[PDB]
Amino acid sequence: PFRDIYYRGQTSLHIAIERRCKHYVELLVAQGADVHAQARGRFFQPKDEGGYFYFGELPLSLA
Amino acid sequence: VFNRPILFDIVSRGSTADLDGLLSFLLTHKKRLTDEEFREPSTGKTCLPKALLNLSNGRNDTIPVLLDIAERTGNMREFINSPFRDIYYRGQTSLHIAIERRCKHYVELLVAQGADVHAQARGRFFQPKDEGGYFYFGELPLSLAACTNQPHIVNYLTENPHKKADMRRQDSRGNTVLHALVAIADNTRENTKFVTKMYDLLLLKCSRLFPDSNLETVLNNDGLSPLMMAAKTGKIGVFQHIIRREVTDEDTRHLSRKFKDWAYGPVYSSLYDLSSLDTCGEEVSVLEILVYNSKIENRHEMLAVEPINELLRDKWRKFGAVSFYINVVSYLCAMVIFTLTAYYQPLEGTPPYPYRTTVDYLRLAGEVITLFTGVLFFFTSIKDFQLLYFIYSVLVVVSAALYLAGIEAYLAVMVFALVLGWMNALYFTRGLKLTGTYSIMIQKILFKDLFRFLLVYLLFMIGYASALVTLLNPACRDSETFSAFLLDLFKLTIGMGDLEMLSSILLLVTYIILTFVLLLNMLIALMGETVGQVSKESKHIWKLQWATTILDIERSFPVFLRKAFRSGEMVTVRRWCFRVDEVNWS
């Protein structure tokens, strides 16, 4: 659970899925990664709300 | 031999038996191979030039055996180099010629034998196309190998086991290989591609050889720098690649102009390195050259390169809008104060110091504001389009001087100042409300209309007048000769009609018809030409005026005040970087 106003809630699972590799996603989730992650970061808000990339703030929506 | 031309023919034809017999009697007569006999009286061409110009499909493998004659002749140093004397060819050397013919074997032979790779061929034929020449390549053998799309020989000459012309070396023009490579750079696709590829190769090689200072830094006598030279001479083909230069090798990281800091999937925050597009008034920058110069042929597209356009937009949003609005509003309010002071100008003339009333005090305050703005404008003009501004400043100064003299009948200069300033008002308003078609309009029709009108109008007027005064020694007049009434009559005709004459002679009506139709169709043609030219200003002209306004504002207030573009890191990535955000789904 990050704390930056520039990155709030970003989780390792989001990052792993983002890098476009499924093996580490499988490892993390099998280990028990919280797939219900609400990454409510300013950088995650739509481009017209001061953010840079909005994807639904969910690991599945991010994939 | 007995005459040089037969020797020249023999060397051109590549014969050897007669040729080594020639060598034989040259040994017999103890004559140097560089004697006046072997050099033309005017051009001084040696055997080597003529032999190489006659290159037969690269089959000159024998004439090096001819060159072997040289050490037997005892004059080897001066023999290789060929300092021509023609004004049409000054300094051209055999090495230049050999490299030009697009063959590396003879270049290798010559250089290994000790060819002077530091050759400054300062020939008129070698000067740029706009200085009476025909081909400029930097006046250096290495720059000549480069400009002529010859990668292998620029590699070799920089890697030969002998003297290897250092890339850093500057010609008389000071250009160096980079400046020369951008000099012949064309905006066309093939020239652009080959020039940019070789430019990369060259800079990377020089960096590897000289990590201390990348070749970009070294300027010319003009001092522009390669990028600024590609900018000043409308070289978009190179420019657009110069801006976005990013390379791979770790030792070649510093020599890049577009880093990539972070990415989050489909979003890329590309960090352009505009370390030279804004010097904060220290030195010249690509923005100043690009916007404050008209010799550029590709301004509009050269203002579309990513960092320049985004940097203009950033300078606008951050500081351009506020300063521009303050400036325009202050100008309008101060000149409205001037106008009201003129309207409330003290009555009954004779204003020595007629202010003993509260409204009089307000008028004096307005006049003081007018004088303050006029003198400040004069200061800006002298410190510094500017034509009309200076005219306004001087007119305000003169009007103030005359008013302080307490003399009458000299408010006319004040009114002139007012009208000129409000004419400058449209120039300043060009930037407001996304306007500016009006400036284009003023610089489009103004001169043509007055030219044609004045001419044909006064002309048919005098033609009319000759016959009119022929009829009358009454209607147009009472007595005496004055073309003024005829001018008034023609104004009545063109604008008013209901024209009257003494006559109640037909060629007069012909004059009227011709002038009327000519003026009407002139207006039609002006409309057509204006609509053709503007084409909605191609959606670009206003952008150029906008950039002009932004840069003018930025230069106006001092830059030591910390109003600058984005900043960045300290080392290995102290480059005053700027950021840009773009999303791509590839």
XYZ file of C-alpha atoms in Angstrom:
649
model
C 0.000 0.000 0.000
C 2.044 2.929 -1.298
C 1.524 6.355 0.266
C 2.641 8.833 -2.413
C -0.039 11.219 -3.613
C 1.584 10.517 -6.988
C 1.086 6.763 -6.379
C -1.609 5.725 -3.879
C -2.407 2.044 -3.431
C -0.253 0.699 -6.267
C 0.446 -2.980 -5.608
C 3.176 -5.357 -6.739
C 0.584 -7.379 -8.663
C -0.333 -4.333 -10.755
C 3.351 -3.800 -11.530
C 3.961 -7.443 -12.441
C 0.948 -7.571 -14.761
C 1.965 -4.250 -16.306
C 5.390 -5.484 -17.420
C 3.595 -7.892 -19.809
C 4.766 -11.177 -18.257
C 2.417 -13.827 -16.872
C 4.853 -16.108 -15.028
C 5.441 -13.701 -12.147
C 1.741 -12.821 -12.068
C 1.041 -16.530 -11.608
C 3.665 -16.833 -8.875
C 2.362 -13.811 -6.958
C -1.325 -14.725 -7.201
C -0.703 -18.379 -6.326
C 1.208 -17.157 -3.277
C -1.945 -15.227 -2.345
C -1.739 -11.797 -3.953
C -4.788 -9.669 -3.132
C -6.442 -9.485 -6.547
C -8.939 -6.985 -5.073
C -6.623 -3.969 -5.102
C -8.029 -0.433 -5.396
C -5.085 1.630 -6.658
C -6.628 5.063 -6.107
C -3.563 7.019 -7.178
C -3.555 10.448 -8.778
C -1.250 9.080 -11.478
C -3.950 6.430 -12.042
C -6.777 8.928 -12.612
C -8.009 9.865 -16.102
C -5.844 12.139 -18.219
C -8.289 15.028 -17.676
C -8.127 14.858 -13.852
C -4.394 15.477 -13.442
C -3.485 11.810 -13.907
C -1.719 9.955 -16.695
C -3.399 6.538 -17.121
C -6.769 5.261 -15.875
C -7.496 1.540 -16.205
C -10.251 0.920 -13.638
C -8.024 0.662 -10.545
C -8.163 -3.137 -10.436
C -5.595 -5.834 -11.289
C -8.008 -7.532 -13.692
C -9.013 -4.236 -15.290
C -5.302 -3.406 -15.459
C -4.566 -6.652 -17.297
C 58.012 14.960 -73.135
C 58.926 17.460 -75.851
C 55.444 18.831 -75.124
C 53.315 18.144 -72.060
C 50.069 17.281 -73.940
C 51.456 13.988 -75.272
C 52.500 13.016 -71.739
C 49.002 13.894 -70.522
C 47.452 11.787 -73.288
C 49.738 8.855 -72.460
C 48.871 8.955 -68.757
C 45.170 9.269 -69.606
C 45.328 6.225 -71.894
C 47.170 4.152 -69.283
C 50.005 2.938 -71.515
C 53.022 1.544 -69.658
C 55.882 0.709 -72.059
C 56.011 4.165 -73.595
C 55.347 5.373 -70.042
C 58.336 3.693 -68.380
C 60.426 4.953 -71.283
C 59.111 8.384 -70.337
C 60.249 7.723 -66.775
C 63.601 6.709 -68.246
C 64.385 9.944 -70.040
C 62.959 11.925 -67.115
C 65.683 10.237 -65.080
C 68.103 11.129 -67.878
C 67.336 14.871 -67.824
C 67.339 15.249 -64.000
C 64.011 17.089 -64.311
C 61.701 17.147 -61.304
C 58.243 15.672 -61.827
C 56.725 18.881 -60.388
C 58.549 21.188 -62.812
C 56.634 23.800 -64.790
C 56.845 21.408 -67.749
C 54.449 18.971 -66.044
C 52.123 21.734 -64.774
C 49.836 23.847 -66.931
C 50.708 27.561 -67.180
C 47.234 28.481 -65.887
C 45.878 25.519 -63.912
C 49.172 23.852 -62.991
C 47.618 20.386 -63.181
C 50.056 17.585 -62.363
C 50.088 14.082 -63.859
C 48.125 12.673 -60.902
C 45.019 14.886 -61.317
C 44.707 14.206 -65.052
C 45.290 10.494 -64.469
C 42.607 10.284 -61.778
C 39.996 12.351 -63.644
C 40.326 9.773 -66.452
C 39.479 6.946 -64.035
C 38.400 4.003 -66.198
C 35.987 1.963 -64.077
C 38.511 1.945 -61.246
C 41.205 0.543 -63.559
C 43.900 3.078 -62.595
C 45.814 0.427 -60.630
C 48.860 1.223 -62.802
C 49.245 4.985 -62.246
C 50.475 4.336 -58.679
C 53.391 2.688 -60.481
C 53.749 6.029 -62.263
C 53.724 7.740 -58.859
C 56.578 5.383 -57.971
C 58.602 7.608 -60.330
C 58.452 10.318 -57.680
C 61.085 9.087 -55.221
C 63.410 8.468 -58.163
C 62.845 12.087 -59.205
C 63.863 13.072 -55.665
C 60.836 15.338 -55.047
C 58.226 13.328 -53.137
C 56.715 15.701 -50.562
C 55.473 18.425 -52.916
C 54.575 15.848 -55.578
C 51.700 14.139 -53.745
C 49.898 17.344 -52.796
C 48.755 19.393 -55.807
C 48.198 23.043 -54.802
C 46.202 24.217 -57.815
C 46.165 27.927 -58.648
C 42.947 28.452 -60.633
C 40.471 30.851 -59.074
C 37.974 28.250 -60.306
C 39.933 25.557 -58.404
C 42.155 26.701 -55.516
C 43.890 24.103 -53.366
C 42.222 21.014 -54.840
C 44.396 17.990 -54.074
C 44.772 14.576 -55.683
C 43.409 12.959 -52.515
C 40.158 14.915 -52.839
C 39.858 13.751 -56.445
C 40.585 10.111 -55.611
C 38.042 10.048 -52.781
C 35.496 11.798 -54.995
C 35.550 9.105 -57.686
C 34.053 6.690 -55.106
C 36.954 4.215 -54.925
C 38.867 3.416 -51.738
C 41.843 1.465 -53.110
C 43.584 4.509 -54.575
C 42.691 6.556 -51.497
C 44.465 3.905 -49.426
C 47.486 3.922 -51.731
C 47.799 7.718 -51.687
C 47.332 8.127 -47.931
C 49.678 5.243 -47.103
C 52.260 6.913 -49.335
C 51.812 10.014 -47.163
C 49.031 12.109 -48.671
C 48.421 15.292 -46.672
C 44.991 14.547 -45.217
C 44.913 18.130 -43.870
C 44.073 19.829 -47.167
C 42.169 23.137 -47.225
C 40.698 23.294 -50.736
C 39.575 26.927 -50.629
C 38.339 27.035 -54.211
C 35.533 29.201 -55.535
C 34.023 26.101 -57.140
C 34.119 24.583 -53.630
C 32.143 27.399 -51.979
C 28.417 27.103 -51.203
C 25.961 27.337 -54.075
C 24.898 30.825 -52.927
C 28.444 32.275 -53.008
C 29.185 31.675 -56.693
C 30.374 28.104 -56.126
C 28.889 24.745 -57.046
C 29.583 22.295 -54.184
C 30.657 22.934 -50.581
C 31.718 19.941 -48.482
C 33.824 21.484 -45.698
C 37.087 21.830 -47.654
C 38.672 18.759 -46.066
C 39.401 15.255 -47.404
C 37.506 13.640 -44.525
C 34.588 16.046 -44.863
C 34.720 15.380 -48.608
C 34.474 11.629 -48.043
C 31.601 12.287 -45.640
C 29.423 14.733 -47.571
C 29.639 12.529 -50.688
C 27.865 9.495 -49.146
C 31.057 7.468 -48.714
C 30.977 5.583 -45.390
C 33.832 3.128 -45.932
C 36.443 5.771 -46.733
C 35.427 8.015 -43.831
C 35.865 4.942 -41.638
C 39.228 4.092 -43.187
C 40.666 7.620 -43.260
C 39.817 7.832 -39.551
C 41.310 4.353 -38.976
C 44.257 4.275 -41.397
C 47.613 3.032 -40.029
C 49.091 6.426 -41.017
C 48.130 10.059 -40.342
C 44.333 9.992 -39.942
C 42.634 13.375 -40.308
C 41.089 14.126 -36.933
C 37.362 14.793 -37.194
C 37.786 17.821 -34.918
C 39.830 19.735 -37.489
C 38.054 22.893 -38.652
C 38.343 24.302 -42.157
C 38.760 27.990 -42.938
C 34.981 28.333 -42.704
C 35.382 26.530 -39.379
C 32.618 24.082 -40.232
C 34.046 20.603 -39.530
C 32.494 17.378 -40.808
C 29.224 17.924 -38.931
C 28.674 21.478 -40.164
C 29.578 20.466 -43.718
C 27.251 17.464 -43.500
C 24.372 19.738 -42.530
C 25.441 22.282 -45.174
C 24.744 19.958 -48.118
C 21.850 18.385 -46.223
C 18.671 18.563 -48.289
C 15.077 18.387 -47.103
C 14.460 15.476 -49.496
C 14.079 11.909 -48.281
C 17.194 10.189 -49.644
C 19.602 13.012 -48.812
C 18.056 13.329 -45.358
C 18.347 9.596 -44.663
C 21.941 9.192 -45.801
C 23.051 12.430 -44.133
C 21.472 11.518 -40.797
C 22.851 7.965 -40.830
C 26.374 9.162 -41.582
C 25.992 11.986 -39.059
C 25.177 9.510 -36.308
C 28.085 7.269 -37.300
C 30.453 10.254 -37.362
C 29.464 11.701 -33.988
C 29.533 8.279 -32.327
C 33.024 7.638 -33.695
C 34.338 11.023 -32.571
C 32.824 10.473 -29.124
C 34.503 7.081 -28.798
C 37.805 8.632 -29.880
C 37.273 11.805 -27.798
C 34.979 11.202 -24.807
C 36.198 14.476 -23.278
C 34.157 16.716 -25.603
C 31.551 15.534 -28.089
C 31.934 17.097 -31.523
C 28.549 18.828 -31.215
C 30.087 21.377 -28.842
C 32.776 22.655 -31.218
C 31.409 25.619 -33.170
C 32.453 27.412 -36.362
C 33.721 30.915 -37.067
C 30.057 31.902 -37.193
C 29.721 30.007 -33.903
C 26.289 28.534 -34.622
C 26.889 24.856 -33.670
C 25.735 22.009 -35.956
C 22.150 22.012 -34.686
C 21.843 25.793 -34.888
C 23.326 25.731 -38.393
C 20.764 23.153 -39.491
C 18.213 25.499 -37.923
C 19.323 28.792 -39.495
C 19.487 27.284 -43.005
C 16.141 25.467 -43.101
C 17.546 21.945 -42.886
C 14.519 20.163 -41.399
C 15.844 16.855 -42.714
C 18.728 16.888 -40.247
C 17.107 19.113 -37.599
C 14.183 16.779 -36.897
C 16.666 13.967 -36.229
C 19.108 16.140 -34.278
C 16.396 16.919 -31.740
C 15.470 13.253 -31.189
C 18.956 11.682 -31.085
C 19.104 8.788 -28.608
C 21.713 6.027 -28.857
C 22.483 2.667 -27.237
C 26.108 2.273 -26.152
C 26.781 3.060 -22.501
C 29.869 5.143 -23.295
C 27.689 7.201 -25.678
C 24.857 8.125 -23.305
C 25.715 11.812 -22.866
C 25.484 12.367 -26.642
C 21.699 11.980 -26.754
C 18.857 14.493 -26.948
C 15.808 12.408 -25.947
C 15.965 10.277 -22.814
C 13.131 8.037 -21.625
C 12.686 8.499 -17.878
C 9.668 6.372 -16.949
C 6.856 4.544 -18.716
C 3.637 3.027 -17.377
C 2.559 0.830 -20.263
C 0.850 2.922 -22.946
C 2.151 6.236 -21.524
C 5.680 7.406 -22.362
C 7.193 10.413 -20.593
C 9.877 11.278 -23.117
C 12.431 13.682 -21.645
C 13.831 15.869 -24.405
C 17.168 17.524 -23.676
C 16.749 21.124 -24.812
C 20.099 22.036 -23.267
C 20.579 24.492 -26.149
C 17.064 25.620 -27.169
C 16.874 28.167 -24.312
C 20.043 29.849 -23.043
C 18.150 32.315 -20.808
C 19.788 35.128 -22.764
C 23.295 33.708 -22.306
C 23.998 32.737 -25.928
C 22.035 32.164 -29.131
C 19.439 29.386 -29.074
C 17.507 27.446 -31.691
C 14.315 29.251 -30.679
C 15.765 32.714 -31.307
C 17.240 31.682 -34.662
C 14.124 29.785 -35.705
C 11.543 32.444 -34.820
C 13.472 35.718 -35.278
C 14.701 34.844 -38.786
C 12.872 34.821 -42.118
C 15.490 33.259 -44.414
C 14.145 29.922 -43.160
C 12.016 28.246 -45.819
C 10.363 25.679 -43.513
C 9.463 27.769 -40.448
C 6.000 26.329 -39.887
C 7.026 22.670 -39.965
C 10.222 23.490 -38.060
C 8.016 24.906 -35.290
C 6.171 21.559 -35.192
C 9.061 19.464 -33.855
C 7.895 18.066 -30.530
C 10.036 19.893 -27.948
C 9.894 23.299 -29.655
C 6.105 23.313 -30.008
C 5.457 21.920 -26.532
C 7.972 24.396 -25.098
C 6.228 27.325 -26.766
C 2.931 26.059 -25.354
C 4.455 25.669 -21.884
C 5.988 29.152 -21.963
C 2.552 30.416 -23.011
C 0.467 28.697 -20.334
C 2.993 29.253 -17.544
C 3.839 32.902 -18.252
C 2.886 33.969 -21.787
C -0.842 34.446 -21.236
C -0.546 36.503 -18.044
C 2.132 38.834 -19.392
C 0.455 39.238 -22.786
C -2.918 40.101 -21.256
C -1.321 42.537 -18.805
C 0.603 44.195 -21.639
C -2.360 44.539 -23.998
C -4.740 45.722 -21.267
C -2.212 48.256 -19.970
C -1.623 49.566 -23.491
C -5.351 49.904 -24.150
C -6.072 51.618 -20.825
C -3.117 54.009 -21.065
C -4.020 54.990 -24.611
C -7.689 55.412 -23.665
C -6.398 57.780 -20.980
C -4.427 59.571 -23.703
C -7.543 59.756 -25.879
C -9.688 61.157 -23.061
C -6.975 63.698 -22.231
C -7.167 64.779 -25.867
C -10.970 64.925 -25.611
C -10.746 66.903 -22.356
C -7.690 68.795 -23.687
C -7.810 72.269 -22.058
C -10.227 74.482 -23.967
C -9.479 77.972 -25.323
C -5.952 76.815 -26.194
C -2.951 78.363 -24.436
C -2.216 75.554 -21.934
C 0.851 76.885 -20.081
C -0.187 75.022 -16.926
C -4.018 75.273 -16.773
C -4.801 72.921 -13.875
C -6.478 74.515 -10.839
C -9.416 72.094 -10.565
C -10.027 68.523 -9.427
C -10.992 67.405 -12.932
C -7.985 69.426 -14.082
C -5.851 67.396 -11.669
C -7.273 64.192 -13.160
C -6.445 65.491 -16.643
C -2.905 66.304 -15.514
C -2.574 62.784 -14.110
C -3.726 61.346 -17.432
C -1.259 63.514 -19.344
C 1.517 62.438 -16.964
C 0.613 58.794 -17.597
C 0.704 59.480 -21.341
C 4.168 61.035 -21.113
C 5.418 58.227 -18.865
C 4.255 55.523 -21.266
C 5.669 57.442 -24.231
C 9.101 57.856 -22.660
C 9.105 54.227 -21.498
C 8.253 53.160 -25.049
C 11.129 55.296 -26.327
C 13.454 53.594 -23.836
C 12.273 50.159 -24.968
C 12.683 51.087 -28.641
C 16.228 52.390 -28.183
C 17.045 49.297 -26.123
C 15.342 47.116 -28.749
C 7.344 46.525 -36.375
C 9.624 48.609 -34.162
C 9.347 51.334 -36.818
C 5.813 52.443 -35.942
C 6.482 52.041 -32.216
C 9.478 54.375 -32.454
C 7.429 56.834 -34.526
C 4.814 56.858 -31.765
C 7.458 57.349 -29.074
C 9.135 60.261 -30.864
C 5.775 61.871 -31.638
C 4.733 61.666 -27.980
C 8.076 63.154 -26.922
C 7.765 66.028 -29.403
C 4.163 66.701 -28.377
C 5.188 66.813 -24.716
C 8.054 69.181 -25.527
C 5.761 71.529 -27.453
C 3.085 71.423 -24.742
C 5.645 72.283 -22.061
C 6.579 75.275 -24.230
C 3.063 76.604 -23.602
C 2.608 77.403 -27.295
C -0.584 76.975 -29.308
C -1.546 75.374 -32.625
C 0.859 72.460 -32.005
C -1.569 69.888 -30.605
C -1.503 68.363 -34.106
C 1.535 66.253 -33.209
C -0.405 64.973 -30.193
C -3.254 63.863 -32.462
C -0.767 62.216 -34.834
C 0.691 60.340 -31.871
C -2.800 59.237 -30.864
C -3.715 57.917 -34.306
C -0.388 56.127 -34.845
C -0.677 54.511 -31.423
C -4.190 53.263 -32.050
C -2.982 51.926 -35.394
C -0.394 50.002 -33.369
C -3.366 48.881 -31.267
C -4.396 46.372 -33.943
C -0.810 45.114 -34.132
C -0.933 44.386 -30.403
C -4.491 42.983 -30.523
C -3.328 40.510 -33.182
C -2.501 38.135 -30.330
C -5.821 38.546 -28.511
C -9.023 36.577 -29.158
C -7.079 34.330 -31.564
C -7.007 37.123 -34.138
C -4.388 38.162 -36.671
C -6.094 37.951 -40.037
C -6.171 41.756 -39.871
C -2.378 42.092 -39.957
C -2.294 39.773 -42.976
C -4.998 41.933 -44.572
C -3.068 45.162 -43.967
C 0.091 43.681 -45.537
C -1.848 42.225 -48.502
C -3.962 44.842 -50.293
C -2.676 48.147 -48.914
C 0.004 48.976 -51.486
C -1.627 47.421 -54.568
C -4.932 49.257 -54.169
C -3.378 52.685 -53.641
C -0.893 52.142 -56.479
C -3.474 51.180 -59.090
C -6.130 53.624 -57.902
C -3.907 56.707 -57.654
C -2.384 55.964 -61.056
C -5.486 55.281 -63.141
C -7.643 57.777 -61.234
C -5.388 60.824 -61.595
C -4.512 59.669 -65.106
C -7.996 59.484 -66.598
C -8.598 62.669 -64.601
C -5.960 64.591 -66.547
C -7.146 63.022 -69.798
C -10.658 64.231 -69.007
C -9.293 67.647 -68.060
C -7.555 68.220 -71.384
C -10.783 67.895 -73.372
C -12.864 69.650 -70.707
C -10.710 72.779 -70.773
C -10.680 72.408 -74.555
C -14.458 72.879 -74.515
C -14.377 75.774 -72.017
C -11.818 78.577 -72.071
C -18.876 77.788 -66.397
C -20.234 74.467 -65.106
C -17.188 72.804 -63.543
C -15.891 76.252 -62.582
C -16.323 79.992 -62.890
C -12.813 80.999 -63.993
C -9.130 80.056 -63.967
C -7.510 76.605 -64.308
C -7.778 74.134 -61.393
C -7.780 70.359 -61.754
C -9.240 70.310 -58.232
C -12.849 70.729 -59.374
C -12.296 67.936 -61.891
C -10.954 65.720 -59.105
C -14.080 66.534 -57.099
C -16.231 65.702 -60.127
C -14.494 62.340 -60.517
C -15.007 61.603 -56.822
C -18.674 62.439 -57.375
C -18.720 60.028 -60.321
C -17.024 57.094 -58.597
C -18.687 57.371 -55.198
C -21.716 59.531 -55.865
C -22.677 59.594 -59.527
C -25.138 62.249 -60.617
C -22.154 63.754 -62.405
C -22.591 67.148 -64.090
C -20.606 68.664 -66.956
C -20.575 71.762 -69.082
C -21.437 69.358 -71.902
C -25.124 68.468 -72.107
C -17.590 64.559 -75.105
C -18.474 60.862 -75.255
C -14.881 59.831 -74.559
C -15.546 61.377 -71.151
C -18.201 58.721 -70.529
C -15.707 56.163 -71.828
C -13.177 57.373 -69.250
C -15.781 57.014 -66.515
C -16.829 53.517 -67.588
C -13.249 52.276 -67.850
C -12.157 53.645 -64.472
C -15.270 52.307 -62.726
C -14.987 48.819 -64.211
C -11.239 48.736 -63.556
C -11.683 49.596 -59.881
C -14.507 47.079 -59.409
C -12.628 44.206 -61.034
C -9.523 45.287 -59.105
C -11.473 44.766 -55.890
C -12.621 41.387 -57.232
C -9.042 40.347 -58.019
C -7.851 41.526 -54.607
C -10.558 39.424 -52.956
C -9.572 36.382 -55.005
C -5.858 36.755 -54.317
C -6.477 37.319 -50.602
C -8.668 34.229 -50.258
C -6.119 32.188 -52.201
C -3.196 33.413 -50.106
C -4.791 33.065 -46.675
C -6.429 29.655 -47.180
C -7.433 30.221 -43.552
C -3.755 31.121 -43.007
C -3.110 27.400 -43.611
C -3.695 27.058 -39.834
C -0.035 28.047 -39.300
C 0.588 31.785 -39.763
C -1.181 32.671 -36.517
C 1.003 30.088 -34.781
C 4.122 31.890 -36.005
C 2.769 35.229 -34.774
C 1.937 33.553 -31.450
C 5.496 32.264 -31.110
C 6.788 35.732 -31.983
C 4.655 37.241 -29.219
C 5.728 34.654 -26.643
C 9.438 35.062 -27.356
C 9.147 38.857 -27.460
C 7.485 38.832 -24.041
C 10.089 36.441 -22.639
C 12.980 38.582 -23.867
C 11.223 41.747 -22.683
C 11.401 41.276 -18.914
C 14.837 40.345 -17.528
C 15.675 36.636 -17.473
C 17.870 36.721 -14.360
C 14.480 36.554 -12.683
C 13.854 32.822 -12.342
C 11.233 32.253 -15.040
C 12.583 29.260 -16.958
C 11.437 25.947 -18.393
C 11.501 22.610 -16.578
C 14.624 21.349 -14.803
C 16.134 17.941 -14.196
C 18.998 15.779 -12.979
C 22.618 16.474 -11.975
C 24.985 14.101 -13.809
C 24.961 11.089 -16.172
C 21.310 11.749 -17.156
C 23.288 18.604 -15.282
C 21.247 18.811 -18.477
C 18.326 21.248 -18.281
C 15.840 18.682 -19.519
C 12.197 19.182 -20.487
C 9.380 16.642 -20.323
C 6.663 15.517 -22.735
C 3.896 12.942 -22.293
C 2.578 10.866 -25.194
C 0.494 7.687 -25.265
C 0.961 5.007 -27.925
C -0.645 1.559 -28.111
C 1.997 -0.196 -30.236
